[PDB]
Structure formats: C-alpha cells, structure tokens
C-alpha cells in the first residue's frame, strides 16, 4: 500500500527521485525551463551532476515526509503552506504539481514493481486542492 511505497521509496530515494524527475521532464519538456541548470543535458548527464542528485533527493525526502504525515493520503495544510511559500516555488501553479503527480503516477503504472498507484493519484490530487487552498493560483 502508500505505506510500504513510501519505504520502497526512501529505500532507494537516490535512484527513484533521479527516475521519477526525469520521467517528469521527459513527458513534459516545457517544465524543463524551469530548471535552467538541467536544459540541454541528457538523462545520463544530469545523473553525473552532483546538484541534480542533491535536488532530486531534498525533494523527494520532503514529498516522502509530506506523504508519511499524510493520513489515508489527505496532506497536511501546513506541508501544503510550506511547498506554497518556498522562494524556488513562487512562479508556480498547480498545473505544475498535477503535472509531476500524473508523470509519477505512471511511471509506478509502468514499472516491474507492486505500487498502489491509486492512492498516489489520489494524494497528488489532495494535495493539488491543499495548494490551492493555500493560496497557489
Ligand atoms: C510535492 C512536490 C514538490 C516538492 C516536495 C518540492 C520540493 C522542493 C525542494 C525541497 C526544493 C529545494 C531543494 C534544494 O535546495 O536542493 C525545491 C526546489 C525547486 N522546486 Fe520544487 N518541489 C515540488 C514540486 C515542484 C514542481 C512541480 C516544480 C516545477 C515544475 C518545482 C520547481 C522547483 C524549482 C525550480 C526549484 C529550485 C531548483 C533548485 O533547487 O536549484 N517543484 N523543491
């Protein structure tokens, strides 16, 4: 269940957080701009930079807390409040975040592995109507 993906997660977050975010960019390359140290690189690239690990570990260890606070996948709005008022996020809207949850969603979908992709789907969308609710256009 989301318990056991949240440990099969942070077992491995180094390798999930570099896969899932280059899953992400991959299926919407209009996000990459975003990011503009990670345009122009390849996947094997960017895992051979040393910031690209550091970013993708500190966001997924958050997504990883935000999600074991969680209960029966409704977020906590104070880690909703937080995602919202970080400086590196103010150009955001949820556009942004469904975007990365439907990209996560289905590459848990496509993997050799058990996730409960259902409750992921559902947590992205809870936690789309808490940044909302926080003040994220
Ligand atoms: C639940 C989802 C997300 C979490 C938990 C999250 C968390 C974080 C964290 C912890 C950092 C700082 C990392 C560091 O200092 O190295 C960060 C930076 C950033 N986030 Fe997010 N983020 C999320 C979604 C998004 C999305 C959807 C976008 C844009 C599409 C985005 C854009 C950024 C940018 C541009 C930065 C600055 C890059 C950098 O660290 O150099 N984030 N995020």
Not at 1 to 22: S, V
Request: aromatic share 12%; with cysteine; glycine share 6%.
């Amino acid at each position: 269940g989301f318990k056991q993906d949240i440990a099969t997660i942070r077992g491995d977050l180094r390798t999930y957080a570099q896969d899932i975010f280059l899953a992400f960019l991959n299926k919407y390359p209009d996000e990459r701009r975003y990011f503009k140290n990670y345009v122009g690189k390849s996947d094997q690239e960017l895992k051979s930079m040393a910031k690209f690990g550091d970013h993708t570990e500190k966001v997924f260890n958050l997504m990883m807390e935000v999600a074991d606070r969680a209960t029966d996948c409704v977020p906590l709005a104070s880690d909703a409040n937080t995602l919202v008022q970080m400086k590196q996020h103010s150009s955001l809207t949820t556009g942004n975040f469904e975007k990365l949850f439907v990209a996560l969603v289905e590459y848990m979908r496509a993997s050799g592995q058990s996730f409960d992709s259902q409750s992921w789907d559902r947590f992205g969308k809870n936690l789309v109507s808490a940044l909302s609710s926080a003040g994220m256009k």
